[PDB]
Write a protein that binds this ligand. Structure first.
Ligand SMILES: Nc1ncnc2c1ncn2[C@@H]1O[C@H](COP(=O)(O)OP(=O)(O)O)[C@@H](O)[C@H]1O
Length: 623
C-alpha cells in the first residue's frame, strides 16, 4: 500500500520492438520478454485488410538492388585486400542440398533455448516466449510496441483499446514469472521507472503513464530517455555520443552534462531486422538449401534471426570459405538438419548499415492505421496549438539527405553550420507540415554520427566536440556484431570532413561567431551609406568576407609548420560477454536506486490533479 521512496518497491521497464526488459533494480539482470502477442486466426477479420503476407518472398531483386550489392561486394573486396585474402569464391555444393533427419535429440544451437514444444490450442491469446511457439497456421502475431512508442501502424489492432489491453496483458505476463512474481492486485505496491525514447511521442508517453497509474494501478511512475539511461548504465561524467542499434530503428543522440542534446537526436529507420532480412536474401542468393523461405512468417523469421545472430561479422580475419549448419524445426514435420557453405554473405549483410538504400528496397512501404493513428493524435501546445514534441535538427537534415559528410568544400559546410540556428528556428514554428511527415530516414550510420556530433556541439557548447569524438558508445542488441567498432571507425574517418576533423575547429568557430557578432553589434548605427534598404547586404557581404578571411586565415594557420592536431574516433563497445541490449535497463535501474528518482516520481494524485502538466515540473529532462 504505503508510498515511501525505497528501491525495493520499484520495477524498471524498458520497452522496445524486440523485447521488453523488465525487473527490480537490484536484479543482476532483467527478464527479457519478447514483444509478441499471438492471436487465434479465427478471432480476426482477415479479408478486406488482407495481406495474408505471412506466406511469400523474393530471391530475384531489382537492378538498383543488384547495383548496390555489386558496389557492396567491391567495398568488401577492398577491405579484405587492404589487410588479408581473396579466392575462387561463390562456386558451390549447396546447389546439391543434403538433409539429415534428426531424432528427438536437439542439443542447443545457441543462447538459452532448445527443441520446440509447440502450441496448437487456438482458444486463447498468448504472450511473449509463449506466443513464439504458437504455430502460425492457427495464429497471427501482433506486437504492441514499436521501440518504446506504441505500435500504431500494425494492421491487427482496430483501436487504442485493443492495443492497450494487450500492452497491459503483456506487462502482467512479464510481471508474472519465475524471477519476479508480481500479480496485478499487488501492483499498487510498486513504483515504475519507465524508459522512453530520446525523441518520444508525447501522446504515447502520456498515454502510457496514464495506463501504468490508472489501469494497472502502480504507485508512481518516473521516466527517462534512452540516451541518458545508457549513460548511467556506463559512466555519465563526460559528454558522450550514444549509438543504439536495435531491430526496427537505429538511434543516435549526444548527451552532455546530464541532458540529451535535442538537436543531436537522430532516428534512422533501419536496424537489426533489416540485417536479418538482407542476410537471408543473401543466402538465398547463394543457393541456400531452403529456397521457398517464408520470412514474414513467424517460423521462418526465427530461422533468419538465428543464423544472422550466429554468423554475421565485420571481422575480416575470420572470413573464409566455410562450413556451417542449422536445423529447420518442424511445425508439422521431423526436425531436418542441413549443411551449407558461406564466404562473404556474413559481411555484406551487416555492411548494409552503410548502404541502407538497399534496406528500403527489400521491404514494403509503411501502411499505418488511420483509424488507430486518429485515436492517438500528436501532442500540441494547449495555447498556441503547435506540434510540441522534441524536434531535432539532425533528424530533419539526415532524413532529407543534407549531410555535411556529403559536402566537398569547406565554405558550404561552414555556411550551413553558420546557418543552423535559423533552420532550427524555421523548424519550431514554420508553416510546418514541411519537413516530411511520411518519409523514413535512411542516412548511412557513419555520416549520421558525424551530424549528430556536429550539431550537438554547435547548438550547445562547441568545446565538447573532442569529448564526443572520443566517447562514442555503441550499444543495443544489434550492435553485438563483432568488429563493428572497427569498420565504423574506419568509415567515420573516411567520411568526416577535414573542416570538422581539425581539433581546433570549435575554438575557431567560437572566434568566427564573435567577429560576426561584432558586425551586427559594434555597428548599431545604420550602415555607412546615407540611404539604404539592401545595405544589410553590404554588411552581409562583409560577413561573407570575414567568413572567408578567417576561413582562409585558419587554413594558413593550419600548416602549423609541422604536426597536426585532429579529433580521434573512439568507438567503445561493451566488453565481450556483456549484453549491449541491456545497458539501458541497467542505467534506468541505477537511477531507480539513487536520491534523485524521489523528486521525479509522478504519483497517482499528482496525475489526477495536474494531468500531463506535471511533466513540466517533475522530469529529468525538459519535457
Ligand atoms: N549476436 C547478435 N548479432 C547481431 N544482432 C543481434 C545479435 N543478438 C541480437 N541481435 C539483435 O539485436 C536487436 C535487439 O533489439 P532491441 O535491443 O530491443 O532494439 P529496440 O530498442 O528497437 O527493441 C534485435 O534486432 C536482435 O535481432
Amino acid at each position: 500500500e504505503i508510498d515511501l521512496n525505497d528501491p525495493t518497491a520499484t520495477i524498471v521497464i524498458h520497452p522496445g520492438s524486440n523485447s521488453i526488459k523488465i525487473g527490480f533494480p537490484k536484479d543482476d539482470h532483467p527478464v527479457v520478454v519478447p514483444n509478441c502477442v499471438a492471436v487465434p486466426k479465427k478471432w480476426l477479420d482477415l479479408e478486406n485488410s488482407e495481406h495474408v503476407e505471412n506466406v511469400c518472398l523474393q530471391r530475384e531483386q531489382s537492378e538498383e538492388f543488384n547495383n548496390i550489392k555489386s558496389e557492396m561486394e567491391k567495398n568488401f573486396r577492398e577491405r579484405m585486400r587492404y589487410y588479408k585474402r581473396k579466392v575462387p569464391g561463390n562456386a558451390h555444393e549447396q546447389v546439391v542440398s543434403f538433409n539429415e533427419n534428426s531424432k528427438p535429440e536437439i542439443i542447443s544451437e545457441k543462447n538459452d533455448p532448445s527443441p520446440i514444444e509447440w502450441i496448437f490450442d487456438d482458444s486463447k491469446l498468448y504472450y511473449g516466449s509463449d506466443a513464439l511457439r504458437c504455430v502460425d497456421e492457427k495464429f497471427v502475431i501482433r506486437k504492441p510496441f514499436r521501440g518504446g512508442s506504441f505500435n500504431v501502424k500494425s494492421p491487427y489492432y482496430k483501436s487504442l483499446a485493443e492495443l492497450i489491453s494487450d500492452v497491459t496483458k503483456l506487462l502482467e505476463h512479464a510481471l508474472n514469472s519465475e524471477t519476479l512474481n508480481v500479480k496485478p492486485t499487488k501492483f499498487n505496491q510498486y513504483k515504475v521507472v519507465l524508459v522512453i525514447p530520446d525523441i518520444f511521442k508525447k501522446s504515447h508517453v502520456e498515454t502510457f503513464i496514464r495506463v501504468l497509474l490508472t489501469e494497472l494501478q502502480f504507485q508512481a511512475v518516473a521516466i527517462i530517455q534512452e540516451s541518458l539511461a545508457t549513460c548511467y548504465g556506463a559512466g555519465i561524467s563526460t559528454s558522450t555520443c550514444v549509438v543504439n542499434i536495435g531491430a526496427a530503428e537505429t538511434r543516435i543522440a549526444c548527451v552532455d552534462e546530464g541532458t540529451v542534446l535535442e538537436h543531436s537526436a537522430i532516428t534512422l529507420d533501419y536496424g537489426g531486422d533489416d540485417i536479418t532480412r538482407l542476410f537471408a536474401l543473401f543466402l538465398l542468393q547463394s543457393d541456400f538449401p531452403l529456397q521457398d523461405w517464408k520470412i514474414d512468417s513467424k517460423h521462418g523469421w526465427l530461422l533468419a534471426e538465428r543464423l544472422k545472430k550466429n554468423f554475421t561479422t565485420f571481422q575480416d580475419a575470420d572470413v573464409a570459405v566455410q562450413l556451417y549448419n542449422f536445423m529447420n524445426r518442424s511445425p508439422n514435420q521431423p526436425t531436418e538438419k542441413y549443411e551449407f557453405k558461406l564466404f562473404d554473405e556474413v559481411m555484406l549483410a551487416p555492411l548494409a548499415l552503410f548502404f541502407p538504400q538497399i534496406f528500403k528496397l527489400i521491404r514494403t512501404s509503411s501502411h499505418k492505421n488511420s483509424s488507430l493513428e486518429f485515436q492517438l493524435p500528436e501532442s500540441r501546445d494547449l495555447f498556441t496549438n503547435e506540434l510540441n514534441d522534441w524536434n531535432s535538427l539532425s533528424q530533419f537534415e539526415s532524413k532529407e539527405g543534407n549531410l555535411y559528410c556529403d559536402l566537398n568544400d569547406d565554405l558550404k559546410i561552414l555556411n550551413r553550420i553558420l546557418d543552423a540556428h535559423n533552420i532550427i528556428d524555421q523548424l519550431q514554428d514554420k508553416p510546418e507540415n514541411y519537413g516530411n511527415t511520411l518519409k523514413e530516414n535512411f542516412a548511412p550510420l557513419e555520416k549520421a554520427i558525424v551530424q549528430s556530433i556536429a550539431n550537438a556541439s554547435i547548438t550547445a557548447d562547441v568545446t565538447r566536440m573532442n569529448s564526443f569524438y572520443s566517447n562514442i558508445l555503441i550499444v543495443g542488441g544489434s550492435s553485438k556484431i563483432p568488429a563493428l567498432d572497427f569498420i565504423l571507425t574506419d568509415r567515420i574517418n573516411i567520411w568526416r570532413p577535414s573542416l570538422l576533423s581539425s581539433a581546433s575547429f570549435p575554438q575557431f568557430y567560437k572566434k568566427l561567431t564573435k567577429e560576426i557578432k561584432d558586425l551586427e553589434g559594434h555597428y548599431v548605427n545604420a550602415p555607412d551609406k546615407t540611404e539604404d534598404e539592401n545595405k544589410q547586404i553590404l554588411q552581409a557581404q562583409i560577413k561573407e568576407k570575414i567568413v572567408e578571411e578567417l576561413e582562409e586565415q585558419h587554413q594558413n594557420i593550419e600548416h602549423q609548420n609541422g604536426n597536426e592536431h585532429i579529433f580521434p574516433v573512439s568507438i567503445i563497445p561493451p566488453p565481450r560477454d556483456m549484453n549491449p541490449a541491456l545497458i539501458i535497463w541497467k542505467g534506468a535501474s541505477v537511477l531507480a536506486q539513487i536520491k534523485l528518482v524521489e523528486e521525479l516520481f509522478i504519483t497517482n494524485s499528482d496525475w489526477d490533479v495536474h494531468g500531463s502538466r506535471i511533466l513540466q515540473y517533475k522530469c529529468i529532462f525538459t519535457y
